[PDB]
Structure 1
């Protein structure tokens, strides 16, 4: 929060900081992961996960965020996650011989979008759509970093990371739709 104050000082808006963080996160994911630099990629993506929380600190230290800022931040989280899984997919698909893992990665790619989508769409209709994102990233990035750990790496960790997530994510989808289903007013006709 002193960081947020100093970033305000220089002329950065919260929106600008989100876009730059997302741009840097995406570039990191798409530069490092396809090269097999999985640990470095993981550290950079975690960094910019954390660094993007500074948008809220900056908004608070300006007396307020905006609705657009909220929407932009969320959209950016989706873009950034898509980019994480796409970089990992590139490494996995073209530098390994684990097609089941390619499948698991694609499931993670799609479910990371859909899980968020269900929430936003549920809210757009006045229903709830949460339950079951930081921990999903924790799983896949820890798996990757350990797989490529600078010492005593455990290559299987990527696959374990991905497969767990893929299952966990699918369940989350089902869970979230259930929360939609059981929201008050969900079944009223209009």
Structure 2
């Protein structure tokens, strides 16, 4: 029983891509389980949650998971508030004063919602953004507080890159050779996410650098190499499995070369992206295989070879596919 009180605006009457923004916001809010009430003077009906939207907005995210007590924002503009039913016990009639009292009386967090504030002179951007949205949100909502905190405590994006890469190589090269595949997989995954935090951090500094991007990518390569090298050490000298080291060497080399194809193609002004296995799928397959092979109490060892062999084949295919991208890029076959 959640109520969504939306303040009326003349711009809601405007139609965007065949539907009125008033209908568009009504449908998005309803999809999120809200009973929608457009209002001019706020009349609070008894409910468990109150989503109060005061500024005209077009919500671009399909799944709106609202919880706690939050302040909804987008691109720095405060769009609305997510209060509890206890707000009814404070609301006296003046919405500004009631909101200020509720904010002073409670602990609230900001909630970045994928949305844009509407005006008479910005509907082209709203149409473009709705089309982009129709053709991640929670990823941003969990990433931005983390990046904010890391910046506040004095860490720079490149520093976080180095820390995540160093910690991931340390976990891979200490835990994997010892046979501790499950804790190694967990530590490596944690610090791979940590390394990926630098992009959000740089976006919060009004922009990153080209060196920072090159460093992030080279560190990705060092981290992948370390994962596969620790796994290779274990498989070769711990399990004493020669076929599986053939698969591991293939995975190592082809992952390096798969990333290198895209880098070098872009260096030549061509494209080289795509493929079945990219770095996220690569890491997931190999780390899940290792973890399942060493899972506590109910370990299934054949998960390690399977993941390794599958990946290997999927890497070889990928290496070809990316080459095809390079082949099909404009200007790739010019005699220049």
TM bin (shorter chain): over 0.9
2:219 equivalent among 66, 76, 95: 76
2:281 equivalent among 125, 135, 157: 135
Higher strand fraction (1 or 2): 2
Residue of structure 1 in register with 2:236 after alignment: 93
Is 1:26 the counterpart of 2:172? The answer is no
Higher relative contact order (CA closer than 8 Å, sequence separation 6+): 1
Instruction: Write the distance in 1 (CA, Å) between the matches of 2:240 and 2:190.
Output: 30
Deviation at 1:123, TM superposition (A): 0.3
Q: TM-score, normalised by structure 1?
A: 0.98
Q: How many residues align?
A: 190
Is 1:67 the counterpart of 2:210? The answer is yes
Q: Deviations over 1:94-145 (max 9, x none)?
A: 0113211000000001011000000000000011001111011111111100
3-state SS, counterpart of residue 166 of structure 1? helix
Q: TM-score, normalised by structure 2?
A: 0.56
Instruction: Write the distance in 2 (CA, Å) between the matches of 1:174 and 1:80.
Output: 23
Higher helix fraction (1 or 2): 1
Deviation at 1:52, TM superposition (A): 1.4
Structure possessing the higher radius of gyration over alpha carbons: 2
Q: Deviations over 1:47-89 (max 9, x none)?
A: 1111112101110111101111110000000000000000000
Instruction: Write the distance in 2 (CA, Å) between the matches of 1:51 and 1:31.
Output: 19
- Structure 1 segments of 4+ aligned residues over 6 angstroms from their partners: none
Question: Which consecutive unaligned segments of at least 5 residues does structure 2 have?
Answer: 1-143
Instruction: Write the distance in 2 (CA, Å) between the matches of 1:28 and 1:114.
Output: 23
Instruction: Write the distance in 2 (CA, Å) between the matches of 1:23 and 1:98.
Output: 28
Q: Deviations over 1:21-53 (max 9, x none)?
A: 100000000000000000000011111111112
Residue of structure 2 in register with 1:155 after alignment: 301
